[PDB]
Amino acid sequence: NGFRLNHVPYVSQQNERMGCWYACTRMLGHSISSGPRLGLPELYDSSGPQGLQQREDVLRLMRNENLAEVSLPESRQFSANELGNLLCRHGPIMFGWQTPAGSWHMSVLTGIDKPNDAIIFHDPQRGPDLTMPLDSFNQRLAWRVPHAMLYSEN
Amino acid sequence: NGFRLNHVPYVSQQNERMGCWYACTRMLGHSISSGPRLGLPELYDSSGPQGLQQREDVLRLMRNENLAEVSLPESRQFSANELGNLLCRHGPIMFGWQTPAGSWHMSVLTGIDKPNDAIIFHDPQRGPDLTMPLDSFNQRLAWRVPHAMLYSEN
C-alpha cells in the first residue's frame, strides 16, 4: 500500500468568502479565527504590490497559527513518490489550485494512489477522499506563490 | 493521534522454532519457508565471524523474499513522527529487540500513539495491538545490526 494518511477528518465549508480556508485548516487540525483578507485569486495568483501584501498576510497567519509551506520544485512538477514522501513526513497538506472555470479553490491532500497515478484529497465543497490525476494536480497547483502548499507544524 | 496502520493481520508464534520470524514475516504479507540459520541473539547481537555470517545470511533472505531494511539513525533514537513517516511509506515493519529479561524477540510495528508517546505492535507471543513506550523501543531496538527493522518491498 503506502503513502496514504487514514483519518484526516473531513470538514465541509460554509458558503462565505474564504469558506474553504477555514474548513481546510480544520482538516489539518487548527482552529483559526482569521484568514486571508481578500479572495483566493488574490491569495494564490496576485502580482506587483498586491502580491507582496498578500504574501505578508499569509506569512503572518503561518507564523501565528503554526503552519509551514512546502518547498516547491522549480520543474513545476511533483512525482508520485515525492508527494507521497512529503505527505508521510508532514501529514495532510492544504493546497491552492485553479479549477476548469478559472476559479481558485483549496483542498487537503491526504494520500497518493500510485497504481492510478493520482492524488487523494478532501474537497471542502465536493466531499472526502476524492482523487484527481497527478497530471492535473501539477497542472493546476498555485505554482506562482511559495505558499501553494501548507502543512501543520503542531 | 499518530500514524496508525489499522489492518495488519495478527499471527502468533506457536511452539515452532524461530516461530517469531515466521509469524512476523506472515504479518508483513510474505510466505517464507526458511529463516536465519542461527537464532535471534546471533541475528541481532553478534559481532566478529558469527556476525559477518549472519549479516550475509540475512541480506540473502532479503534479496530472495523482497524485504528491505530501514536506515538506522546515527543518534540511536527515533521520534514518534519519524516512525510514523516510516510506517506510512513502507507499511508494517518487523523489529528485533531485547527484553528486560535478556532474550531477543521479533515484533511488528503497526502504528504510533502520539499522545502517550508509545509504539503500537503485534507481538507474536503476547498478542495483537500492544503498545510500549517509545523510550523503551529506542533503548531495546537491535541498533547493533543494520537489519534491525525490516519491511516489505512487495
Closest CA to A93 of A22, A149, A141: A149
> At B67, phi and psi to the nearest 5?
-115, 155
Residues of B in contact with A3 (CB under 8 A): 88-89
The identity of residue B81, as a single letter, is: N
> At A64, phi and psi to the nearest 5?
-65, -35
CB A20 within 8 A of CB A103: no
Kindly determine whether residue A5 and residue B91, on different chains, have CB atoms separated by under 8 Å: no
Q: What cell numbers appear for A94 in the block?
A: 492544504
CA distance to A2, B14, B152, per residue, from B25 (Å): 18, 14, 9
Kindly name the residue from A20, A45, A122, A147 that is annotated as catalytic.
A20
Closest CA to A86 of A73, A105, A99: A73
Kindly determine whether residue B89 and residue A4, on different chains, have CB atoms separated by under 8 Å: no
CA of A142 vs chain B CAs: smallest distance (Å): 26
Kindly determine whether residue A87 and residue B89, on different chains, have CB atoms separated by under 8 Å: no
> At A123, phi and psi to the nearest 5?
-110, 120
Instruction: List residues of chain B with CB under 8 Å from any CB of chain A.
Output: 3-6, 84-85, 88-91
Tell me how crowded residue A71 is: count the other CB atoms within 10 A of its CB: 9
Q: Kindly compute the dihedral angle of the four CA atoms of residues A89, B111, B58, B36, in this order, to the nearest 10 degrees.
A: 180
Structural domains in chain A (count): 1
Q: What cell numbers appear for B149 in the block?
A: 527493522
The residue range of the domain holding A117 is 1-154
Residues of A in contact with B78 (CB under 8 A): none
> At A10, phi and psi to the nearest 5?
-100, 130
Instruction: List residues of chain A with CB under 8 Å from any CB of chain B.
Output: 1-6, 84-85, 87-89
Smallest Cβ distance to A88: which of B4, B6, B85? B85
CA of B73 vs chain A CAs: smallest distance (Å): 16
Q: Measured between alpha carbons, how far is A35 from B119 in angstroms, rounded to an integer? A: 36
Helix (H, G, I), strand (E, B) or coil at A91: coil
Kindly determine whether residue A5 and residue B4, on different chains, have CB atoms separated by under 8 Å: no
Closest CA to B1 of B121, B137, B116, B109: B116
Which residues, other chains included, contact B3 with Cβ-Cβ below 8 Å and sequence gap of 6+?
A: A5, A6, A88, B84, B85, B87, B88, B111, B112
Please give the resolution of this entry in Å, rounded to 1 decimal.
1.8
Closest CA to B106 of B98, B117, B115, B116: B98
Candidates B3, B4, B88, B153: best to mutate against A (most CBs of A within 10 A) is B88
Kindly determine whether residue A2 and residue B85, on different chains, have CB atoms separated by under 8 Å: no
Total number of residues shown for chain B: 154
Mark whether A105 is an active-site residue. yes
CB B145 within 8 A of CB B55: yes
This structure was determined by X-ray
CB B152 within 8 A of CB B26: no
Kindly determine whether residue B88 and residue A1, on different chains, have CB atoms separated by under 8 Å: no
CB A65 within 8 A of CB A25: yes
Q: Measured between alpha carbons, how far is A70 from A86 in angstroms, rounded to an integer? A: 8
Buried b (16+ CB within 10 A) or exposed e, B118-144: bbbbbbbeeebeebbebeebbebbbbe
Closest CA to B109 of B1, B2, B5: B5
